[PDB]
Design a protein around this ligand. Structure first.
Ligand SMILES: [Mg+2]
Ligand SMILES: [Zn+2]
Lengths: 50, 1362, 298, 90, 49, 79
DNA sequence: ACTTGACATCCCACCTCACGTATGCTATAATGTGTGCAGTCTGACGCGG
DNA sequence: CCGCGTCAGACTCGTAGGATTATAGCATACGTGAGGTGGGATGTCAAGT
RNA sequence: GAGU
């Protein structure tokens, strides 16, 4: 239920029903999608030598 | 059928025949097309009664003319359908089956009667093996297991004399043949010659079962069921949904299977089927039966056609969705309505807005009666037709009924009794209920869509109780503390604050006014601001001693605003009260003082006034919330960047390596704490004042009018902390768990946080909200348990005449006098007079209730300790005395005889727990605790004087304390204990004993996050048993080769290093054990679990140099988290994990029989001849030196005290004292004030039972656990007549057990363990006399409390008269 | 089993009333307490009267300050609309309108999105103006939003106080409020929670099959459960007859409720209780378990 | 009173007594049509009973007094009737 | 939803605890008026009656 | 019972031929029985569904929490 | 105020009819199997061993 | 002391809608609920009582 | 999905 650092850019840490449902149900973050194996992923920009 | 009692016992099979009217031979219910009942089926009309009123099956005979007519063709009796709720049927079971409940439920009376374990019985029952019933042959007697061919090897050789069988029928047989009478006598004779301890305990238990069994008259053979009773059809009805579909109870499906299998058994018997399949069928029979009673108790249960487990009879009674709690102790009710609440500023205190359409519906029947009596409608049918159209007339009749009717408003949860209040309803348009603002605090209601229920007490009596006892205006004071609940909130306070607050010049400074009315006239003309400082001529009024009017007439200095407010103020209250800028503080005080001195009606009226005022002036004031209203303190980034740059310097200075993990963590966190508080106070200064604009050149200052700040200081909404997060720095928060993050949030909500910072805060947020949910159900459940225990306590007597009582102190727990004597004792009856050398040798007459004014007088005397007559020390049976209880806080007076004080206490104590969870869980979006327990600071100039310690002076020159029993007090001019501080082990001191401390000088000092162990003597550190891996962990670096040893506790230790107690031995320059000055100890300082040993082997320590620092991380729950279970545990009388041990009687104690480090004590009493030897753990720490002259209940061990032990040694008053204080400590942490008397109530309930040594004329004997009430009843009757005496000792039971122990089995059955309690009472043949509350509740009778006292005592006298 | 069926759609035009549920995006929520006539509400110096009056005391302890930001930016957004609407009423020239509008968009020293107008055709220009006549819609994106200073800057372009507070005249009395208050436009919503549905009450109706207690829900014309909690309240008071009402005449006692109904019409208000059906349910289920429970005579 | 029944409360002594004693008088008004002492001013029997006891003109003891009196008058007059039935009995 | 001119201020306890004060002008303009399309079904069954 | 058995064996085939469902008329055709009789059997075909059935998807209600007794003439009418 | 008799409409009971229901009988050989989810918690008092 | 077992875990209300099954057939004997027509029981009328 |  508790808030994991991994949720960053994948699930909104801040969208969930209050009460006993809390922690269980969470909305997908904006840019986020499922990878090949159904794992959560986030798009990121490359930075080459500075 | 107007009844006295309820008895429960085993149902006899032939008694079951008696109740049952007919045998259900067929599993069929009804015909598929014609849904009439089938012949001998489950819904049979011949057995259970006719489907439809006064009409038989075949339908020749109908009408009332036929009653008791018995249709010759069909065999249907002609009567009321209602009979199908009350006729039972029955089944003839072919194989006598055992009752599951008496097997699988613990302890299992069958098993305990036969002293036979479960498995044996199982294998027997399930036909896996045979067992010996009756052995003519000596080889084998009762209760021997035989296998398949062991039975054959037995039968072949013996037989004739040899009797054995298989299964439940065999067990039935063994049940009949066992000798009831003889065995009881046998056992006591066994006891007479020899009683090894545990053997005698079990033999005792068994004796109790047996005796109870034959007294109740329950026959053991009844354990085996021959006849199976069958539930009335209406209770398991069969109904069509309108779509053609059907619904049937789960009982029906279990029952059907029962019949199917039983009929197959009849077939198999007539066919003479082989043993294997006959046995299999008996298994199946047993299954079906036991599934029907309690499904799944037996292991894998029968499921629904769905998947869902079938719902058995047990589920029906027991479950929370069972009959008790859902349908019996509570239900759905008519004449109630429910809808959204809306504000009613215009409503009076005792009023409420009631929506048109709601009230129309509610008050339906009242309408009809008056419609017909006034003749507006010809009959009731026409009255209905006239209501359903709805003309002007209808509304008028409603008006007349609603006139002087009181209606009840309810909000869930029912936190306390004021969750329902009575009001005069006033009709309004719309569908919304209007609630009075004042009472929102009691309901804890707020306007964001909350709904309320509105019930109608219908009778004159209901109306009376609602208006008189439940009326809003009657109940202002919390039953919990004496103080008001119905009080100013938010806007109210704000308006008041606005008016009372004073301002530089503005308009009309220094005007002199002829009376108050002029003030308002001036404001309204705009010729003066309300903030303007003014001289007004006003007459303050005074109460006399007899109650007259005392007009005093002269000059007051106030604002315009305060003059207006003095208008509101009632005749006789001093000006002093309004003279100050009123906040939440001042407001409540006004009301309080007013109530206590003036009285009821005046206060009622005045409170309303104050409400309206506040609204008004809030409105003209025009207070709002703009972005600039939140002022970012001038020096924010300066103070922040400085703290940041310095922390950066210490991180760079990390790589250099004078930086352990502990020190760095400490350093970072402390610099951040100090920086935030700097920021806080600069933000507060800025916001707090800020009227420093130029007076044409130079500047000036006064109290500015910032709206947020005003809300803060007013106590209107904000507190300082919230402000801090808004305009200041948000601060540090808590990570996922206990972890506290190093870098804080420097920014504020004004600036806006970013990705990272906002993300950071979510952890705490989510954690908080999940707590508010899931952690509150614990508190609710706890409360219900309290409720159930505390029901029977009612005021029956005025005064039984007890002299006994509990000595209450002003609680000087460490740091200050957190709760004084006055606060703890107010409104209590005293027992005895206390003497103190005082202003003139104080004496105070006893049996006296101490009123407020009594208290004031005793305040001037300054008595410390007061014996007060307690609820516990009450002599009254089953309940308490008016005197022993004292004031009913809610009413202000002495409690009314008859009022149920038990539930009173419970509601008050459950209420806050439930609140103090929810609140800091949905408002405190992060986590921290005040743990800067750094320095002590003496406030006022006095002498330093120490009690209880022994220190040892070092090289640097600090007075370092090595005692666990240390306090540091403050003496004033002529010798008294004013101020008190609590200093832990290892704390450096400054001034020792005798010397004077000047104001605000640092007299004590210690580092918080680290308790050092400090040596008393000098020399070289010698290492004993600290090997690497076993008891310590090597942490070593390069550089010059420095390290820091960590001595690990039990968890990280391998299996070989379990008993190894790591030490640091004190040897000298020569080698030999240097001894601590004057004492015999070779100084061996036992470093505890995880003692991070900085000073390694080889560095000559000076006397008072640290050997090893002990870290204790107090993450800091606070809240009601750690609090809740601790409270619960004290109330459940649960011995804590490390209980300390005590001494039994008095006299010189000594050592003797010593194991390795297992201490032994042989206490031989100087008076008492006997020696008590008690063994002591090795790792257990002792507080005592050796030979002392001890008293009973002498604490020796370290830790929290086990409640039971305290009860046994000290006795009642001390244990009770400990409970009260220890509980109260938690709630004091939260600042929720509750009277000790409630806690006292509970404890008396927990003392309900005792243990008997020595026989009366009755059913006693050794070690029986009988009620305290039955002991005193025996006292009366036996002392007066003679007979042999009985010695008793009091016992302590916590909560659940105490509740289950009470002689009210329907009470206990309603609580928990429904199954178990029923069986015990059934075997006991117990008779419930029905004196308690919930009993009558469930029966729909008159509660024996209060209003129902009269009727209930009448039945009691009718018991005496035959 | 079903011969025929007809579906019918009702169209209700449901008007807002007191007790309906409304909120903003910031978690600030509330019930309508009273709808005031236009006269009652405070008004501007300009004569523009207010729409909604929200309690400032809902702010500080709940710690959502963003709603204040929305209010300020919201007034300035409409301030834009004000001035534009004025120049629309005043006709004027394309060019001048174009100037005002573009200088507005390019307001931020730090803006990303640069809408250099120029190329736009006269059609598109006057068209755009008409649309922004209703108050110009702005985009603060999450965390990457509009700083307070840029908001202050725009409040100058709205020709309104930079603090976003205005002195208000009380439409009832004519007295000014002594100090200015925060006014401006905020985006409100009416919830799916309609007081229309939340209203429900029951005197007499359908009862439960087994227990013979009143049913649940507006769907059955059900009554509220008076729970053990509520019981506890009554118990705290000495209120025995009210309690007994709830236990018997109001629920499972058939003879009792009917009799007391008739008594009420007749103006008696005597109770005369009976035996609640639930308790009989209890008895019979215990005897089904082969457990004998008898109620003993005196 | 109307607002706060506290004065009436104080006149009797106990809260609960007040409620029950008031109900018995209010019931009498309802049932017997017994005549309200203080001019009615359309109050409910709740309030009527409250007022009477407020002024102290009803007491539990005087309610029972009124019962004793009217019961004695009933027996005196129905001496004639119960005597005929009584002679019949033996 | 819709956007209104709000004024942050305490009223004579009509805005008490997050409660809302609102103008008749809202109804005048017909803002915040919901269309609810509610469904009902009439069923003609066959009993053996 | 045997008639019910026929019903369901045929049901499979017919669903596969049509690509959808069997209407009583079409079903009645293939069996050469009177439509009324078919419909009767279809209704009678419904098995006992449990009164204790958790109607509440959230364990709210045991179907019983719906059922009202229409036998009871209402206190209105009793008056 | 009432009865009598005539003539004409309505209510109760027993008989032949037809569908519905209860139970038997079948012959190549068929002979050791089904089956799942429950759980994770969590302090708790208790007996058993 | 580990073993495993047993028993607990808020308050009210509010909103959506219920079926998947695999299953042979029949020839015969017996019982159970019903339509279709005559005897007996009240209903309605017109004179004359 | 409401609120405490
Ligand atoms: Mg709320
Ligand atoms: Zn019959």
């Amino acid at each position: 239920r508790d808030v994991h650092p991994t949720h960053y850019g994948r699930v909104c840490p801040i969208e969930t029903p209050e009460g006993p449902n809390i922690g269980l149900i969470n909305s997908l973050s904006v840019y986020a999608q499922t990878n090949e194996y159904g794992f959560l992923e986030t798009p990121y920009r490359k930075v080459t030598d500075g | 059928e107007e009844f006295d009692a309820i008895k429960i016992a085993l149902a006899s099979p032939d008694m079951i025949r008696s109740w049952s009217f007919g045998e259900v031979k067929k599993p069929e219910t009804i015909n598929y097309r014609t849904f009439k009942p089938e012949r001998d089926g489950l819904f049979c009309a011949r057995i259970f009664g006719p489907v439809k009123d006064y009409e038989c099956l075949c339908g020749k005979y109908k009408r009332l003319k036929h009653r008791g007519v018995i249709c010759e063709k069909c065999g249907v009796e002609v009567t009321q359908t209602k009979v199908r709720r009350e006729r039972m049927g029955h089944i003839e079971l072919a194989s006598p089956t055992a009752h599951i409940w008496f097997l699988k439920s613990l302890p299992s009376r069958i098993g305990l009667l036969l002293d036979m374990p479960l498995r044996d019985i199982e294998r027997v029952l399930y036909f896996e093996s045979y067992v010996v019933i009756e052995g003519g042959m000596t080889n084998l007697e009762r209760q021997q297991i035989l296998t398949e061919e062991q039975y054959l090897d037995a039968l072949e050789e013996f037989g004739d004399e040899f009797d054995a069988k298989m299964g439940a029928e065999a067990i039935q047989a063994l049940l009949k043949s066992m000798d009831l009478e003889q065995e009881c006598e046998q056992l006591r004779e066994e006891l007479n010659e020899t009683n090894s301890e545990t053997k005698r305990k079990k033999l005792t238990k068994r004796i109790k079962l047996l005796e109870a069994f034959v007294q109740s008259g329950n026959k053991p053979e009844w354990m085996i069921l021959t006849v199976l009773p069958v539930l009335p059809p209406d209770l398991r009805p069969l109904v069509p949904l309108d779509g053609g579909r059907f619904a049937t109870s789960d009982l029906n499906d279990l029952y059907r299977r029962v019949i199917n299998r039983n009929n197959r058994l009849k077939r198999l018997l007539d066919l003479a089927a082989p043993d294997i399949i006959v046995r299999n069928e008996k298994r199946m029979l047993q299954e079906a039966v036991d599934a029907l009673l309690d499904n799944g108790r037996r292991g894998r249960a029968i499921t629904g056609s769905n998947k869902r487990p079938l719902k058995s009879l047990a589920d029906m009674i027991k479950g929370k969705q069972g009959r008790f709690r859902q349908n019996l102790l509570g239900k759905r009710v008519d004449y109630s309505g429910r809808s959204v609440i809306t504000v009613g500023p215009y409503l009076r205190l005792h009023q409420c807005g009631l929506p048109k359409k709601m009230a129309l519906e509610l008050f339906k029947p009242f309408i009809y009666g008056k419609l017909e009596l006034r003749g507006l409608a010809t009959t009731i049918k026409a009255a209905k037709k006239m209501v359903e159209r709805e003309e002007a007339v209808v509304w008028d009749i409603l008006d007349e009924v609603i006139r002087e009717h009181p209606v009840l408003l309810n909000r869930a949860p029912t936190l306390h009794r004021l969750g329902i209040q009575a009001f005069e309803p006033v009709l309004i348009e719309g569908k919304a209920i209007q609630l009075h603002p004042l009472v929102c605090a009691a309901y804890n209601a707020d306007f964001d869509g909350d709904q309320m229920a509105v019930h109608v007490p219908l009778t004159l009596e209901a109306q009376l109780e609602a208006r008189a006892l439940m009326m809003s205006t009657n109940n202002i004071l919390s039953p919990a503390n004496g103080e008001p609940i119905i009080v100013p909130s938010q806007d109210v306070v704000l308006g008041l604050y606005y008016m009372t607050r004073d301002c530089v010049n503005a308009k009309g400074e220094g005007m002199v006014l002829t009376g108050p009315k002029e003030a308002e006239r001036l404001y309204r003309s705009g010729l003066a601001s309300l903030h303007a400082r003014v001289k007004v001529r006003i007459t303050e009024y005074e109460k006399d001693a007899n109650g007259e009017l005392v007009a005093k007439t002269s000059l007051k200095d106030t604002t315009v605003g305060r003059a207006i407010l003095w208008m509101i103020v009632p005749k006789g209250l001093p000006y002093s009260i309004v003279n100050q800028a009123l906040g939440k503080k001042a407001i409540s005080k006004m009301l309080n003082t007013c109530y206590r001195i003036l009285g009821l009606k005046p206060t009622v009226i005045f409170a309303d006034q104050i409400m309206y005022t506040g609204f008004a002036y809030a409105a003209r004031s025009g207070a709002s919330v703009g972005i600039d209203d939140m002022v970012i303190p001038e020096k924010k980034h300066e103070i922040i960047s400085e703290a940041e740059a310095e922390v950066a310097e210490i991180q760079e200075q990390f790589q250099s390596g004078l930086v352990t993990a502990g020190e760095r963590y400490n350093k970072v966190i402390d610099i951040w704490a100090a920086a935030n508080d700097r920021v806080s106070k600069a933000m507060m200064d800025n916001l707090q004042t800020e009227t420093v604009i130029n007076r044409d050149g130079q500047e000036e200052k006064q109290v500015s009018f910032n709206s947020i700040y005003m809300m803060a200081d007013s106590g209107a909404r904000g507190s300082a902390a919230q402000i801090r997060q808004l305009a200041g720095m948000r601060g540090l928060m808590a990570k996922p768990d206990g972890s506290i993050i190093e870098t804080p949030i420097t920014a504020n909500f004004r600036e806006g946080l970013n990705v990272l910072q906002y993300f950071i805060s979510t952890h705490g947020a989510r954690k908080g909200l999940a707590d508010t949910a899931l952690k509150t159900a614990n508190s609710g459940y706890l409360t219900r348990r309290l409720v159930d225990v505390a029901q029977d306590l009612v005021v029956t007597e005025d005064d039984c005449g007890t002299h006994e009582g509990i000595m209450m102190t002003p609680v000087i727990e460490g740091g200050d006098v957190k709760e004084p004597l006055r606060d703890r004792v107010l409104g209590r009856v005293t027992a005895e007079d206390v003497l103190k050398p005082g202003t003139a040798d104080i004496l105070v007459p006893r049996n006296t209730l101490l009123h407020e004014q009594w208290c004031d007088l005793l305040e001037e005397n300054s008595v410390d300790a007061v014996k007060v007559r307690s609820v516990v020390s009450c002599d009254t049976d089953f309940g308490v005395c008016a005197h022993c209880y004292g004031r009913d806080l809610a009413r202000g007076h002495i409690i009314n005889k008859g009022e149920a004080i038990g539930v009173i206490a419970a509601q008050s104590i459950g209420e806050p727990g439930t609140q103090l969870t929810m609140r800091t869980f949905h408002i405190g979006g992060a986590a921290s605790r005040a743990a800067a327990e750094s320095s002590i600071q003496v406030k006022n100039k006095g002498s330093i004087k120490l009690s209880n310690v022994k220190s040892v002076v070092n090289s640097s020159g600090k007075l370092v304390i090595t005692s666990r029993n240390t306090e540091l007090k403050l003496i004033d001019e002529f010798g008294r204990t004013k101020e008190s501080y609590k200093v832990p082990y290892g704390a450096v001191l400054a001034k020792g004993d005798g010397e004077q401390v000047a104001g605000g000088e640092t007299v004590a000092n210690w580092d918080p996050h680290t308790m050092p162990v400090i040596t008393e003597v000098s020399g070289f550190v010698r290492f004993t048993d600290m090997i690497d891996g076993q008891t310590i962990t090597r942490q070593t670096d390069e550089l010059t080769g420095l390290s820091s040893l960590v001595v690990l506790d039990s968890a990280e230790r391998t299996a070989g290093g379990k008993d190894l107690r790591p030490a640091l031995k004190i040897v000298d320059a020569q080698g030999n054990d240097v001894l601590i000055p004057g004492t015999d100890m070779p100084a061996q300082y036992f470093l505890p679990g995880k003692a991070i040993v900085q000073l390694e082997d080889g560095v000559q320590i000076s006397s008072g140099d640290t050997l090893a620092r002990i870290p204790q991380e107090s993450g800091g729950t606070k809240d009601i988290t750690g609090g809740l279970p601790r409270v619960a545990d004290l109330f459940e009388a649960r011995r804590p994990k490390e209980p300390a041990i005590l001494a039994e009687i008095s006299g010189i104690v000594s050592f003797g029989k010593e194991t390795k480090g297992k201490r032994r004590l042989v206490i031989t009493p100087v008076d008492g001849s006997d020696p008590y030897e008690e063994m002591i753990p090795k790792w257990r720490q002792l507080n005592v030196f050796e030979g002392e002259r001890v008293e009973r209940g002498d604490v020796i061990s370290d830790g929290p005290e086990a409640p039971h032990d305290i009860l046994r040694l000290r006795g009642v008053h001390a244990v009770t004292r400990y409970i009260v204080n220890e509980v109260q400590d938690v709630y004091r942490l939260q600042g929720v004030k509750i009277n000790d008397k409630h806690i006292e109530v509970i404890v008396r309930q927990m003392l309900r039972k005792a243990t008997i040594v020595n026989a009366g004329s009755s059913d006693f004997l050794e070690g029986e656990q009988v009620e305290y009430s039955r002991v005193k009843i025996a006292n009366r009757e036996l002392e007066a007549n003679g007979k042999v005496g009985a010695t008793y000792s009091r016992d302590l039971l916590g909560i659940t057990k105490a509740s289950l122990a009470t002689e009210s089995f329907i009470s206990a059955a309603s609580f928990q363990e429904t199954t178990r309690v029923l069986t015990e009472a059934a075997v006991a043949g117990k008779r419930d006399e029905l004196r308690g509350l919930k009993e009558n509740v469930i029966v729909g009778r008159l509660i024996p409390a209060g209003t129902g006292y009269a009727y209930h005592q009448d039945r009691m006298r009718r018991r005496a008269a035959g | 089993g079903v011969l025929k069926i007809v579906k019918v759609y009702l169209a209700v035009k449901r008007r807002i009333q007191p007790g309906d549920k409304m909120a903003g995006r910031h978690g600030n929520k509330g019930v309508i307490s009273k709808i005031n006539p236009i006269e009652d509400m405070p008004y501007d110096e300009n004569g523009t009267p207010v729409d909604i009056v929200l309690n400032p005391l809902g702010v500080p302890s709940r710690m959502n300050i963003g709603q204040i930001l929305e209010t300020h930016l919201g007034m300035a957004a409409k301030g834009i609309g004000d001035k534009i609407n004025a120049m629309l009423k005043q006709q004027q020239e394309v060019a001048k309108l174009r100037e005002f509008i573009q200088r507005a968009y390019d307001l931020g020293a730090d803006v990303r999105q640069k809408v250099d107008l120029s190329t736009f055709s006269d059609e598109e220009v006057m068209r755009l103006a008409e649309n922004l006549r209703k108050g110009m819609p702005i985009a603060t994106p999450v965390f990457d939003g509009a700083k307070e200073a840029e908001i202050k800057e725009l409040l100058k372009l709205g020709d309104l106080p930079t603090s976003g507070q205005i002195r208000l005249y009380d439409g009832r009395t004519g007295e000014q409020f002594e100090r200015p208050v925060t006014v401006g436009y905020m985006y409100m919503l009416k919830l799916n929670h309609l007081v229309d549905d939340k209203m429900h009450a029951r005197s007499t109706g359908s009862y439960s099959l087994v227990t013979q207690q009143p049913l649940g829900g507006k769907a059955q014309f059900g009554g509220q459960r008076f729970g053990e909690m509520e019981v506890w309240a009554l118990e705290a008071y000495g209120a025995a007859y009210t309690l007994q009402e709830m236990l018997t005449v109001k629920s499972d006692d058939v003879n009792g409720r009917t009799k007391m109904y008739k008594n009420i019409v007749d103006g008696n208000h005597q109770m005369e209780p009976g035996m609640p059906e639930s308790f009989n349910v209890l008895l019979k289920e215990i005897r089904s378990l082969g457990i004998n429970i008898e109620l003993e005579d005196e | 009173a109307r607002v706060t029944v506290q004065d009436a409360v104080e006149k009797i002594g106990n809260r609960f007594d007040l409620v029950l004693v008031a109900a018995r008088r209010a019931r009498q008004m309802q049932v017997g049509g017994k005549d309200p002492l203080v001019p009615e001013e359309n109050d409910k029997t709740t309030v009527i009973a409250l007022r009477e006891i407020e002024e102290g003109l009803i007491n539990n003891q005087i309610l029972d007094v009124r019962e004793r009196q009217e019961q004695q008058e009933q027996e005196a007059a129905e001496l004639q009737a119960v005597t005929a039935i009584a002679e019949g009995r033996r | 939803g819709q956007n209104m001119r709000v004024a942050f201020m305490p009223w004579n306890g009509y805005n008490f605890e997050d409660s809302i004060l609102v103008s008749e002008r809202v109804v005048q303009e017909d803002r915040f008026t919901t269309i609810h399309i509610q469904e009902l079904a009439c069923v003609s069954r066959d009993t053996k009656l | 019972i045997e008639t019910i058995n026929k019903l369901n064996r045929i049901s499979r085939q017919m669903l596969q031929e049509m690509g959808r469902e069997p209407t009583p008329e079409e079903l009645a055709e293939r069996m050469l029985m009177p439509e009324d009789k078919i419909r009767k059997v279809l209704k009678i075909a419904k098995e006992p569904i449990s009164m204790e059935t958790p109607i509440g998807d959230d364990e709210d209600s045991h179907l019983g929490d719906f059922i009202e007794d229409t036998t009871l003439e209402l206190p209105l009418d009793s008056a």
